[PDB]
Nucleic acid binder design. Sequence first.
DNA 1: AAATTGCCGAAGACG
DNA 2: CGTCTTCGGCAATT
Length: 355
Amino acid sequence: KLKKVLDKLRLKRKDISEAAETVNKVVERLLRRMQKRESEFKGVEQLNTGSYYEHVKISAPNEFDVMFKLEVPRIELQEYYETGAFYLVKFKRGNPLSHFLEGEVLSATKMLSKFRKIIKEEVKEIKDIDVSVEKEKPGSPAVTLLIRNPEEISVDIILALESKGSWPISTKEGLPIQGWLGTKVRTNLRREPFYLVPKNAKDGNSFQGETWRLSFSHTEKYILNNHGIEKTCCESSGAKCCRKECLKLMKYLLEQLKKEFQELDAFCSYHVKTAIFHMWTQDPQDSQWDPRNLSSCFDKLLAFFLECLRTEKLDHYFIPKFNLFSQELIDRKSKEFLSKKIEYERNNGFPIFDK
DNA sequence: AAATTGCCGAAGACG
DNA sequence: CGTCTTCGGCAATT
Ligand SMILES: Nc1nc2c(ncn2[C@@H]2O[C@@H]3COP(=O)(O)O[C@H]4[C@@H](O)[C@H](n5cnc6c(N)ncnc65)O[C@@H]4COP(=O)(O)O[C@@H]2[C@@H]3O)c(=O)[nH]1
Ligand SMILES: [Zn+2]
């Protein structure tokens, strides 16, 4: 049954070819524009991120996430209150970024506005492809493209500051992978740079326009590609596990529920991905994720998610004091609403999987 | 030093 | 299952 759902969720090679060809053409053109010439974003490099490049994209290849990352040396971070995730950026000259300053502080809003303006002008010159820039979203770090290939494809272009220093201390007790992927992996991952994206902290019913947010799309991608306690997990001379399949089933469940209940707008795939990371830490043995145990693994994930929902607590995997299910982010009656919907599908063999 | 190229793992496709 | 194929990612090369 779950097996038949996964077959339905599996992407088609022909759809992947058509979508990728068009997406890569458009992105490459955008990145080229950033490089040339008197652009403040001149040194940006591309990193592909999110569901599709993690191989956990379901149903259709119609959503692509890409980071344009700018190394900016000699920055000092100041934690915006005690959020753990949000920061203000200051500088340790006649530099490319001096006009994005709001006093001594590097403004996320200003920098993102220019970045978006450049993309809009470049997109206007694309004539062989039907692509447009979607309207700006409140507190989004993304410049979102809309492509008609003729099928609809969304591409999020995410500006990110790259910092080569050690990660901010709010992450010190995050990434608890020591009994799973191990201490050498954790240490090496934490020696990689960290990123800030111009997503603003929500302060009441407004946004703080200078704040940036930590991003670990890079570490997350590595983990999804290197997810076993055994090095050969899912390799050609190793054993297939069901970790990713279990994540797909969960994303699907949430996706289907979101399509018909508007009171679930505050929930998203990132909550599901965060939940399963915790599950992978809780159950690190590959033997616990044998494909023969898919049903029980999915049920265990469901139970864990319901418990996060009920206790109003889902710790960011990298920033443990940052609660994705705080009352401030998601109202209590939204969590109770999702709770009842999940229990129903769980007690009725997921009729919603039949669309 | 932008752009090309080699190399192969991940996973879809099909028997 | 095994074998084949395409795509993504990386960095040496020029
Ligand atoms: N592409 C992309 N979109 C993002 C990201 N963060 C947030 N968003 C979209 O930006 C709009 C405002 O974000 P919200 O905080 O209101 O809603 C998000 C956020 O709560 C959380 N979420 C999603 N992704 C993350 C990541 N990567 N880290 C931490 N929290 C995350 O859940 C909601 C998910 O909805 P979303 O598709 O992200 O839409 C957000 C809103 O459009 C981002 O990093 N990358
Ligand atoms: Zn595996």
